[PDB]
Design a protein around this ligand. Structure first.
Ligand SMILES: O=C(O)[C@H]1O[C@@H](O[C@H]2[C@H](O)[C@H](O)[C@H](O[C@H]3[C@H](O)[C@H](O)[C@H](O[C@H]4[C@H](O)[C@H](O)[C@H](O)O[C@@H]4C(=O)O)O[C@@H]3C(=O)O)O[C@@H]2C(=O)O)[C@@H](O)[C@@H](O)[C@@H]1O
Length: 227
């Protein structure tokens, strides 16, 4: 018997502003269904306090997608609309099983390309330095595929305990704060006028080396706010 995330109060504000996609982007459960007790092995309340996401398979996901609150439709905002768009979370990333290589846990996505992905990464060299078992940001500065289209940053090594995140977008600039420390005024002006941006959070499994290996991510808190 699995306990539903909506059975406690902690996540109700964000569930009232999200739909769930599982196991792919095109298969979704509405905000109303989430508030109404949606539960499964992919999305349940773990140890009485964690909104836990689980997913296996290449490019599969169990992920919340920002909606207009109170039964509204899909949100679309712009990096240059003058409003500050903020996402906060507290995440416990447990040890990922063999075959899981990268798990995107928060995003700014849009109808064009992902402006930002915060992901757990097993192993990567960045600007001549090797990092392992760590949290990375990937920001797009163009629409191409080569590395010049991205800015990748080591944010923090994965910790045993909960790790807090804050993503702030205002006036075409991005700030990321991890455990209260600023880790990224990153320019987003390439995306000026893109009116389809939205936040996501959960687990999106990228480039696994086993199709059966299950990514698993635990949220102690998640909120998205517009000021
Ligand atoms: O930097 C290196 O050294 C290596 O980079 C390798 O290329 C990377 C890119 O740098 C990006 O990380 C790129 O991110 C992709 C994701 O792989 C994934 O396709 C994602 O998919 C979106 C998609 O838009 C879809 O519509 C839906 O929204 O799901 C996804 C989402 O929710 O975000 O889109 C990202 C993107 O396009 O920005 O991934 C590649 C990669 O191959 O993994 C590579 O060049 C390697 O050789 C380098 O060593």
């Amino acid at each position: 018997f699995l306990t539903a995330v909506s059975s406690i109060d902690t996540f109700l504000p964000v569930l009232n502003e999200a739909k769930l996609q599982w196991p792919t982007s095109a298969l979704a459960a509405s905000s109303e269904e989430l508030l109404g007790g949606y539960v499964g092995s992919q999305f349940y309340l773990q140890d009485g306090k964690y909104m836990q996401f689980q997913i296996a398979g290449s490019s599969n996901r169990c992920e919340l997608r920002q909606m207009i609150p109170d039964g509204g439709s899909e949100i679309g905002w712009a990096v240059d609309d003058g409003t500050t768009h903020t996402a906060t979370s507290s995440i416990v990333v447990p040890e990922q099983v063999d075959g899981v290589e990268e798990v995107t846990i928060m995003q700014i996505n849009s109808g064009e390309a992902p402006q930002l992905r915060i992901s757990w990464i097993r192993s990567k060299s960045l600007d001549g330095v090797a990092y392992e078992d760590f949290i990375m940001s990937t920001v797009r500065i163009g629409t191409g595929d080569s590395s010049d289209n991205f800015v990748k940053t080591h944010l923090a090594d994965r910790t045993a305990g909960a790790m807090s995140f804050q993503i702030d977008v205002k006036d075409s600039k991005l700030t990321i704060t991890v455990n209260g420390n600023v880790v990224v005024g990153q320019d987003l002006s390439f995306w000026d006028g893109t009116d389809s941006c939205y936040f996501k959070a959960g687990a999106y499994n990228n480039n696994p080396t086993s199709e059966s290996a299950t990514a698993r991510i635990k949220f102690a808190a998640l909120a998205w706010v517009d000021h």
